[PDB]
Amino acid sequence: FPEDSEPISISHGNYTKQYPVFVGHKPGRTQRHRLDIQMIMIMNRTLYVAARDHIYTVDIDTSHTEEIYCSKKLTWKSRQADVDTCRMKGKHKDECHNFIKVLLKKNDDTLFVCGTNAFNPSCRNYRVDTLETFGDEFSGMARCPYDAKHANIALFADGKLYSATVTDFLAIDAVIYRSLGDSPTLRTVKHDSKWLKEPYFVQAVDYGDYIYFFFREIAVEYNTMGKVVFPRVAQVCKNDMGGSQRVLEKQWTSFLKARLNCSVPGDSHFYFNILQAVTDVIRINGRDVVLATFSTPYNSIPGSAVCAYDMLDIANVFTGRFKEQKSPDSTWTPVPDERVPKPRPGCCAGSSSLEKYATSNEFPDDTLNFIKTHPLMDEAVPSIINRPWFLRTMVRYRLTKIAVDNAAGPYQNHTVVFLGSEKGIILKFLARILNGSLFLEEMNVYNPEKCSYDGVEDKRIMGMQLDRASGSLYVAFSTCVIKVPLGRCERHGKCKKTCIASRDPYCGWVRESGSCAHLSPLSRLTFEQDIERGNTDGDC
Amino acid sequence: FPEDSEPISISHGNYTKQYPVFVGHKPGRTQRHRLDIQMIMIMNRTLYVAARDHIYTVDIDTSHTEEIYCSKKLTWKSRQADVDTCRMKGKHKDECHNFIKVLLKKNDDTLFVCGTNAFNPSCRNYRVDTLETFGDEFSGMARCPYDAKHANIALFADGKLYSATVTDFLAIDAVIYRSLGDSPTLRTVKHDSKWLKEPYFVQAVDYGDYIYFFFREIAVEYNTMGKVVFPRVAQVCKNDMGGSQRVLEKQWTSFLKARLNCSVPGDSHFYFNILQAVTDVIRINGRDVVLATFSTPYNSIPGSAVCAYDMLDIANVFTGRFKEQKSPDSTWTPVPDERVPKPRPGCCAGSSSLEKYATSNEFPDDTLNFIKTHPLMDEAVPSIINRPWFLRTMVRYRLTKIAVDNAAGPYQNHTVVFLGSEKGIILKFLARILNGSLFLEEMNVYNPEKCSYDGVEDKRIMGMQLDRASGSLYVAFSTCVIKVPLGRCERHGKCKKTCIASRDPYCGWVRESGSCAHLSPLSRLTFEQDIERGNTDGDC
Amino acid sequence: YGVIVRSEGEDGKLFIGTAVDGKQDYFPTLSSRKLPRDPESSAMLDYELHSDFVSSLIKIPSDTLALVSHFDIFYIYGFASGGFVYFLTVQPETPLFYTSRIVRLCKDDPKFHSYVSLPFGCTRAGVEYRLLQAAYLAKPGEALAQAFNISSDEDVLFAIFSKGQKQYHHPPDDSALCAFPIRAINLQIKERLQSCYHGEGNLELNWLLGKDVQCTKAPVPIDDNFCGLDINQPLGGSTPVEGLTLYTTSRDRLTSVASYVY
Numbered sequence A, B: 001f002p003e004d005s006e007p008i009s010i011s012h013g014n015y016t017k018q019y020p021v022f023v024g025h026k027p028g029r030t031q032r033h034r035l036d037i038q039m040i041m042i043m044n045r046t047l048y049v050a051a052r053d054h055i056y057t058v059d060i061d062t063s064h065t066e067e068i069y070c071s072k073k074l075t076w077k078s079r080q081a082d083v084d085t086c087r088m089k090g091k092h093k094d095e096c097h098n099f100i101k102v103l104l105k106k107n108d109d110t111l112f113v114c115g116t117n118a119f120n121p122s123c124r125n126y127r128v129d130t131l132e133t134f135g136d137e138f139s140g141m142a143r144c145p146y147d148a149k150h151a152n153i154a155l156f157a158d159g160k161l162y163s164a165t166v167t168d169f170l171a172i173d174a175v176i177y178r179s180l181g182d183s184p185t186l187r188t189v190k191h192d193s194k195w196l197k198e199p200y201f202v203q204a205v206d207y208g209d210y211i212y213f214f215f216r217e218i219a220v221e222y223n224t225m226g227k228v229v230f231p232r233v234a235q236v237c238k239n240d241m242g243g244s245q246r247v248l249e250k251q252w253t254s255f256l257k258a259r260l261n262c263s264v265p266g267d268s269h270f271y272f273n274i275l276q277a278v279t280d281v282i283r284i285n286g287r288d289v290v291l292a293t294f295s296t297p298y299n300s301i302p303g304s305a306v307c308a309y310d311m312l313d314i315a316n317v318f319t320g321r322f323k324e325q326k327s328p329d330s331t332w333t334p335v336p337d338e339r340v341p342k343p344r345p346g347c348c349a350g351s352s353s354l355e356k357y358a359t360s361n362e363f364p365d366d367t368l369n370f371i372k373t374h375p376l377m378d379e380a381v382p383s384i385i386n387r388p389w390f391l392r393t394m395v396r397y398r399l400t401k402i403a404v405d406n407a408a409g410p411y412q413n414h415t416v417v418f419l420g421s422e423k424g425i426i427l428k429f430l431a432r433i434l435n436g437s438l439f440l441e442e443m444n445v446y447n448p449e450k451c452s453y454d455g456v457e458d459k460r461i462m463g464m465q466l467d468r469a470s471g472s473l474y475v476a477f478s479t480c481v482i483k484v485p486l487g488r489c490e491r492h493g494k495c496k497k498t499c500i501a502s503r504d505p506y507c508g509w510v511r512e513s514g515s516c517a518h519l520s521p522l523s524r525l526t527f528e529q530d531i532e533r534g535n536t537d538g539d540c
Numbered sequence C: 001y002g003v004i005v006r007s008e009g010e011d012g013k014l015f016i017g018t019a020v021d022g023k024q025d026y027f028p029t030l031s032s033r034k035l036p037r038d039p040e041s042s043a044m045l046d047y048e049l050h051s052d053f054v055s056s057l058i059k060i061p062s063d064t065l066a067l068v069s070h071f072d073i074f075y076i077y078g079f080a081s082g083g084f085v086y087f088l089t090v091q092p093e094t095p096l097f098y099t100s101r102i103v104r105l106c107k108d109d110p111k112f113h114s115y116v117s118l119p120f121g122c123t124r125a126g127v128e129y130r131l132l133q134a135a136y137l138a139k140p141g142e143a144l145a146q147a148f149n150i151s152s153d154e155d156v157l158f159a160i161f162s163k164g165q166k167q168y169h170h171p172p173d174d175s176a177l178c179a180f181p182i183r184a185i186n187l188q189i190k191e192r193l194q195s196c197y198h199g200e201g202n203l204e205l206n207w208l209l210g211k212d213v214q215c216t217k218a219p220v221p222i223d224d225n226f227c228g229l230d231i232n233q234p235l236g237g238s239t240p241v242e243g244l245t246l247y248t249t250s251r252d253r254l255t256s257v258a259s260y261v262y
C-alpha cells in the first residue's frame, strides 16, 4: 500500500496567523459572539457568508487590511412562536434558530434564501442591492433542511429549483426534489430504499441535458452481509415532466444512480467509500471533469483520497446494463439488454429514439415500471487514471473540501488543487498533465487568536472559495473566514534556490528584482521557474 | 474509531543492545555468514534453532554471557543432485538448499525433522542425545513445504502427524493432512475450494477430541463481489478413520471450518481479517483460550489487533447451522436443521448419538455426502469481550508473533502478553481480569550490531519462546536470536516513583534493598506494587 | 474415446478420454491404463501409475462443476501420431459458450506432466467454425502437402466444425471441413511451451487449475519431443490453432468425415 508523499513546503500557524480574517466586524473596531457560519459563496464580486440569523457580505475587491470587514448584513430571525414550538419538541436552545442553509442567485437582482427557521424550513426572495426581502415568505419543505447540521443540495437550472434534503422533522423522508420554474414538482419515490437509502447529500452539477447528484448512501448491493456505505452519482433529465396517470405520476421518470469507484487497485482493491466533497464541472486537459474527496468509514482506520471523474465516463455508466436482484435471496446481477424496455429507461423525451414523445408523461408503462424498479446501474464509474490522484493515510484527520484552479501559472495552464480538512489544514497539489500529482504545500490556516472565541474552537473547514481575480482562497470556519493567498511566492525573498525548488506554478524567480514573486499572464517581465523538476544545483 | 494508547515505558535500542544474542558461534570467538533461521522451539531445557542446513541447540540454563553460544549442531545439507534439479527448474540459488521447517519431539529420545531439501521436501528421525539420524530418509510430501518462505503447520497427537502445507512444487495443492501413527492417512478433498481456497496456514492445537487448525483463505462467502481473505478455525476428529468405499474414502469425514470474528463493532463493524499468529491453548481466568493477532489486508491502511477465543465458543460454532449456497447465483444462507442428516456431520464416531458406529468408515452416505458439500459453518466465532483486547493503528508495521505468560507476578496470577512485529519491536500488555488491557511496554529489541551482517538487515520477528524458568523471552530473527528479560525491574534502581508507576506484574519495590526488583513466588521478602493504579503522589 | 499405445517390446497402455457424468471423484476425465499382452494379467486396466499424490490421470475439479451447471468434457476423437497421443474435446467455457480443444500427451509420460491443451477451429469469409463435430486422421495428398509445406507421408487431421461457439445441442446447418497438419499443431505447442518456459504470461487453463498460474522461467531446452516437467503444467492457452478450411455449407449439416489418398 502506497506511502504518503512529503510536501515541498510547510506553513505553520507561526506564519499564517498574518492572513486577514473575517469575524463579522464593521470598520471601526465589543465582546465576540459565535457566528455559526454555515457556508460561503462568491457571486459577482461579493463574498456571501451564510450564518445564523444573518447573511454577511464582504467586498472582495476593496479588502486590504489585517481584518476583513462586513459591508452589508441581511437579518432574518425566527419568530418566537417557531422557537417555542422547536424547544417544545425537545430540540436544544442553540438549535432553535434560523440557520441559513440555502443561498442562490435567482436572477441578476434576486437572491433565493432558505433557513432552517427553528426546525420549520422556510424560503424567501431578497433584492440583491438592498438585501431586503420582497414578497411573502414561503415553504422550505423539501428545499431546506430542518437541522443546520444536516448536509443539503440546492441548485437552480432554467428557473427550476433542484434540491436534496429531508421533508420531515424526524428526517426519515430523504428526497431529491424539483419545484418552481413554471414546471411540475417532482420527487423520488417516498419510502423506496432502492431509490434512496439513508442518503447524505453532497453536491449537484448542471451538465448538458441532465442534473447530476453526488451523495452517499447505504448500499443495497450489500443487503446480505453488513451495512456498507457507497458513494453515488445520479442523473435526472432537466426536461422531466413526471410519469403517467398510472406510473410515477409526480415522480422522476429519469432517475438513475451508480456507484463511484475510488480505489487503490491490488490483490484486493481498497475502496474509499465515504464521499466528502465534489467540485463543480471543471475543464481540465480538454476534458470536463469533477474532482471528489473520499474517506474511509468513521469506524475504521482513517484515510482520505482524491479521485477525478470525466463527465463522459459518468454519462457512459448510464447507458450500460441495469442491476437487479432475481430474488430476495440472490446476489445482484446485470439485467440482459433483451429484457430492457423500449424506449430505454433514463433517456430524455425528445431524444434520439424518442422524438415521438412530447414529454415523459407519454412514456409507456413498461418503461416507467422498469425504471421505477431498477434505479441502480450495474457498473461503477471508473476514475480518471483508475486510481486516486492524491492520498493521505498517515494523519488523524480527513480531507473534506476541495477547490481547483485550472488556469494557474504564467501560461494559465497548470492545474492546482486545494484540499481542506477537519483540522483546518489546507493541502496543495499540482495535477500532472492527467496522470499523478505533486505535493506542493501543507499549511495550517486556522487562527486560534482570531477564530477561537465565545467558547468555540472548531477547526472544521466548512467551505472554500477560490477567487483568481483577488489571488486568494477564502476558507470558512464556524467562527471565521480566512483569506489565503494562492501562492507563497514573495515569501522566498531573495533566495533563488528555495524559489525554484518550490516547483510552484504561481511562483518564479524574477531577474529584475532579484527576487521570487507571483507571476501573472500580464507580466511582460522575464521569469525563471522549473516545475518539471526542482533542480537547485545554494544556499540561503 | 478508538485511538492507540501510550505505553508506560519505552526501551530504545540504546538500552536493549545489551541483551545477549545468539549468532551461531561456539565458545572461543571469523567472518559471519547469514544463518537463515526458520523457527525456534524450546523442549525440555534446550532451545532449538532450526535454520538452513542445520539445527543449532542452546543450553538455556547455563547461558550467562553477552553472547549466547551453540552447544551442539545438527547438520543436514541437500545432495548436489537435488540442488541441480532445483536450479534447473528456475529457482534461485539461495532457495535451493535444505531449510529446516519441521522440528518435533516424536518421543523422549527422538526428534522428527523435515527440510525443504531444495524443493524436494524430505523427513528424517534423529536421536535427541547425539543429534545423529537413524534409519532411512523418507518423503516430506504433504508434511513439509518446498519453499522456505511458505507457512506450514506440523503437530503430533497420539503418534499421528497432523500437517498443513502444499503437496506440489507449484504449490497449487494446499492440503490438511494426517499420516503415521499406525493410522490411515487422510487429506482434504483435492481441488475443492469449498474445503480450502488458497489457504495460508498459521497454527494447530490439540484440544479434547479434536485438532483445531487456524488459517486464512479466500472467502467463498464473498464469491460474488471481490476477493476477500477471511481468518478460519477448523476442527477434525482425532479418531477420524476416513469415509466409506463410496464417499470420502481416504479423506476427512470430520472437517468443518468457521470464520473467526475479530472486529471493532460500530455503525458498521471493522474487521481485522488477516490472521498473523495464534498461541497454544492457555488457561486464563479459569478458561481455556487461544490468543491471535490479526492485521488489515496488505493493500490497505495498516492496522493490527489481538483477539482472544474461548475453546468452548469454538466448539460451540461447530454445533450450529451449516452454510450453503442455494444456487450459483444466490447469497450464502443457513441450512435448516431439518435438512441436516443423522448422525450429525462433524460428530466423532463413538460419540453420544454415535456409539453405534465403530469408526467413520461405517458412517452413512447422506452424512458423508452432506459434510463433503458443507464444510463451512454459518456463524463466526465470537471473541472474548466481543472486541480486540489490543489495537495498533498508528504505526507502519504489523503485529505478528505472540507469547503469553499466564502466571506472572508474586502470586502467579497476572496475564501478560508479548507481541512481536515486522520491525523487531516487542509490545507488552497486561490482560485485565477478562476485560480490556493495559499497555506496559514498547521495546526495540533488534540489534543492528549483532544481527545486521552478511548483507542482511531483516527485522522480522520469526518466533518467540517465553521461558519462565530462565526469566526470558527468546526472540528469533533471520540472522540472530535474542534473549530478552521478561521484566525491566532492576532497571529503576532506587527510584520508587518509577518502579511503582511501571504498574508491571513482574516488578515491585523491595523495602530491604531500597530498590526495584523482579518478584518471585519464592520470595519471603516484603514488596510494594500498585498494579491496579500507578499512584505516585517524587521524583528521580 | 480411446487410443491404444503399444510398441514392439512394450506391454501396452490405453489412453481413455470420457465425460464423467458429474461424478468427478469416481471417474477421471482422461487417463492412462495398463493394457498387458496377457489377457489374464493381474494388472489389466489398472492405472499406468498410481501414487498418493501422482497418478496417470486428470480429474475434473469440483470447482468447475460448481461454476458451470452440468459441466462435462466430451471426447470427440483421439489418435496417435509420432511420439504423442491427441484428444479432441468439446466443453462449456469456464466463465453459453463452448470451446473445442486439442489435448496432447507424450506416449511415455506416466505422470501426465506433458499435458497441453489448445483451442482449435477454422474460419472462412468472416464466418468462424469453432464447434467440433467430427474428425479423422489421414495423409495429406500432394496438393495439401504443398499447401502445408510438409512431406507426403506426414499426418493431417481432418475435422468438421459447426458455426460459432454456441448451441452445442442444436447446431445450425452452417458447417465446415477443415484440415490441420500435425506439424503445425506440434509447432504451435512447442512455441507455447517455449514462451511459457521463458516466463511469459500464465498457464491459462482455468477449468483444470482453478486459478491464474504464472509461467515459470527456467533453463530448460524445449525440443520437438519435450515431455514436460513438474513446472509449467498442465499447460493451456487462449490463442486457437487455425486449420485450413476446405469446404463449407449452409444447407445440410456436415456430421462425419473420413479420408484417404488415391
Ligand SMILES: *[C@@H]1O[C@H](CO)[C@@H](O[C@@H]2O[C@H](CO)[C@@H](O)[C@H](O)[C@H]2NC(C)=O)[C@H](O)[C@H]1NC(C)=O
Pocket (backbone or CB within 6 Å): A261, A262, A263, A265, A266, A269, A379, A380, A382, A383, A386, A387
Ligand atoms: C474500480 O477500478 C479499478 C481500476 O480500474 C478496477 O480494477 C480492475 O478490475 C478489472 C476487472 O473488472 C481488472 O481486469 C483490472 O485488472 C483491475 N484493474 C487493476 C489495476 O487491478 C475495479 O474493478 C473497479 N471496481 C469496480 C467495483 O468496478
Ligand SMILES: *[C@@H]1O[C@H](CO)[C@@H](O[C@@H]2O[C@H](CO)[C@@H](O)[C@H](O)[C@H]2NC(C)=O)[C@H](O)[C@H]1NC(C)=O
Pocket (backbone or CB within 6 Å): B261, B262, B263, B265, B266, B269, B379, B380, B382, B383, B386, B387
Ligand atoms: C462480530 O462480533 C460483533 C460483536 O459481538 C458482532 O456485532 C453484533 O452484531 C449483532 C447482530 O448479529 C448485534 O445484535 C450486536 O449489537 C452487535 N454487537 C455490537 C456491539 O455492535 C458481529 O455481528 C460479529 N460479526 C459476525 C460476522 O458474526
Ligand SMILES: *[C@@H]1O[C@H](CO)[C@@H](O)[C@H](O)[C@H]1NC(C)=O
Pocket (backbone or CB within 6 Å): A044, A045, A108
Ligand atoms: C457585478 O459587479 C459589477 C461591478 O463590478 C456590477 O456593476 C454588476 O451589477 C454586477 N453584475 C451583475 C448584476 O450580475
Ligand SMILES: *[C@@H]1O[C@H](CO)[C@@H](O)[C@H](O)[C@H]1NC(C)=O
Pocket (backbone or CB within 6 Å): A411, A413, A414, A433
Ligand atoms: C503551459 O503552456 C506553456 C506555453 O504556453 C508551456 O511552456 C508549458 O510547458 C505548458 N505546461 C503545460 C502544458 O502544462
Ligand SMILES: *[C@@H]1O[C@H](CO)[C@@H](O)[C@H](O)[C@H]1NC(C)=O
Pocket (backbone or CB within 6 Å): B044, B045, B108
Ligand atoms: C529434560 O532435562 C533433564 C535435565 O534437566 C534431562 O535429564 C531429561 O533427560 C530431559 N527429559 C526428557 C528426556 O524429556
Ligand SMILES: *[C@@H]1O[C@H](CO)[C@@H](O)[C@H](O)[C@H]1NC(C)=O
Pocket (backbone or CB within 6 Å): B411, B413, B414, B433
Ligand atoms: C492475584 O492473587 C493475589 C492473592 O493471591 C491478589 O493479591 C491479587 O489481587 C490477585 N490479582 C488478580 C486476581 O489478578
Ligand SMILES: *[C@@H]1O[C@H](CO)[C@@H](O)[C@H](O)[C@H]1NC(C)=O
Pocket (backbone or CB within 6 Å): C149
Ligand atoms: C517449406 O519448407 C522448406 C524446407 O522443407 C523451407 O526451405 C521453406 O522455407 C518452406 N517454405 C516457406 C515457408 O516459404
